[PDB]
Amino acid sequence: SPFPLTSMDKAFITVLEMTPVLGTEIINYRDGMGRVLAQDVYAKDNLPPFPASVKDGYAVRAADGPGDRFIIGESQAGEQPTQTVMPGQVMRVTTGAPIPCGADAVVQVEDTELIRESDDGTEELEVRILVQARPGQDIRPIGHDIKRGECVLAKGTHMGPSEIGLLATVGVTEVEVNKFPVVAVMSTGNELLNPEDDLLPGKIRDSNRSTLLATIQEHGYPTINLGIVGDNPDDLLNALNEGISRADVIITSGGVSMGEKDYLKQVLDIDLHAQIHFGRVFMKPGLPTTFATLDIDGVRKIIFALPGNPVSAVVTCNLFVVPALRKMQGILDPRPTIIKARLSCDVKLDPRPEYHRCILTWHHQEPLPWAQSTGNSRLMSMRSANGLLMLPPKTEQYVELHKGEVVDVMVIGRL
């Protein structure tokens, strides 16, 4: 210290490189949302497991051709038929019903006309097949969708609803996945009160802990609220040790300026014996951001000490923390999605790469979304930030960007 000013790219790479992938565990398939498979998943049955009708209509012998047929009965979804269709006969089928022995094609009800019923009109007796069925027509043969022994989901797959459904389809209800990181969050500073407290002289309410916890929670990960910790080395060590014991990841905010009353980086190094990989970043906001690892009992814990400024803390959490958590839970490429958007407003550039929350809006038939920086319309004011504007460092030629120009926006929210 002063720690060297680390370049943004180097800082980001270092976080991903130094972050570990967590161990695996078996879960029930219904709890798979957002999880990554640590195993291949195989089908042990065919889908369909029996030749299945695609349509409501009639199972026929294509060789009988068009004409008038006796209806020998009905194959219903859920029941294996026991009759065999002999030439000049058909059996009624519905969508999903098994095709009976002796039929080789299905004709949909629309290509037929009913001749005879039962006086009850309970039973169709005879039907006119108006078309020449193509062989195998409107039948899903055994294994058409999935074969027995087929690998349906590969290790590394990040699961959403359809993947949960596929597990359900093949009956693999328990799967091995990577664990989710448990994330512990503290705030430090003698000025901070809880959100629940009325103000006292010289104090303000801690908003970072809430905003950071909600951010991590939005991504699906379990959290621990370590509370407010004062500006003093002894209490910081205790809190940090508690965090280490209870979590995979610790996030702090405040206590990382160069000033006094700022001991956190010192505690990380000497007291905790952590390795600090960077202690400042050439970025705006986020200058004092610090990243450390701690290897204890063959397990690596990671520690992010973010700036106390509330805006810096959310921005740095999105840039550095979220990707790391994605790596820890097994996502193979944990990097954020970056899209192109048009600036809604002129901006003057900083020597530092700069980042700002924004709202992405796609207009009527315009191909690119507009990025509107938050903090300046009501209808828009009722929209939570869903992007982080990524402004390029000032260069001798480019000192500002104009409304309309195409910029990178990192996605941080829905849509």
CB of 320 to Ca ion, least distance (A): 20
Give yes or no for a contact between 159 and 99, defined as CB atoms under 8 angstroms apart. Answer: no
Give residues after which the chain gaps, C-N over 2.5 angstroms.
376
3-state SS, residue 339: strand
CA 291/CA 330 separation, integer angstroms: 20
CA 43/CA 166 separation, integer angstroms: 10
CB of 203 to Ca ion, least distance (A): 12
Residue 353 binds to Ca ion (criterion: CB under 5 A): no
Q: Which is nearer to Ca ion, 108 or 253 (CB)?
A: 253
CB of 334 to Ca ion, least distance (A): 31
Q: Which is nearer to Ca ion, 75 or 253 (CB)?
A: 253
Q: Which is nearer to Ca ion, 181 or 307 (CB)?
A: 307
Give yes or no for a contact between 229 and 209, defined as CB atoms under 8 angstroms apart. Answer: no
CB of 1 to Ca ion, least distance (A): 16
Residue 330 binds to Ca ion (criterion: CB under 5 A): no
CA 25/CA 31 separation, integer angstroms: 12
Residue 307 binds to Ca ion (criterion: CB under 5 A): no
Number of residues that bind Ca ion (CB under 5 A): 3
Residue 57 binds to Ca ion (criterion: CB under 5 A): no
Q: Which residue is nearest to Ca ion (CB)?
A: 189
Sign of CA dihedral 369, 372, 378, 382: positive
Q: Which is nearer to Ca ion, 191 or 271 (CB)?
A: 191
Question: DSSP for 58-121?
Answer: EEE-GGG-SEEEEEEEEEPTTS----BPPTTEEEEE-TTPBPPBT--EEEEGGGEEEEE--TTS
Residue 189 binds to Ca ion (criterion: CB under 5 A): yes
Scanning 107-115, 185-193, 207-215, 276-284 for contacts with Ca ion by CB under 5 A, the matching segment is: 185-193
**Contact positions with Ca ion (CB under 5 A) in 387-406:** none
Scanning 35-43, 107-115, 307-315, 339-347 for contacts with Ca ion by CB under 5 A, the matching segment is: 307-315
CA 168/CA 197 separation, integer angstroms: 48
Q: Which is nearer to Ca ion, 53 or 290 (CB)?
A: 290
Scanning 6-14, 308-316, 343-351, 391-399 for contacts with Ca ion by CB under 5 A, the matching segment is: 308-316
Place of tokens 């990243």: 291
CA 390/CA 12 separation, integer angstroms: 14
Binding site for Ca ion (CB under 5 A): 189, 254, 308
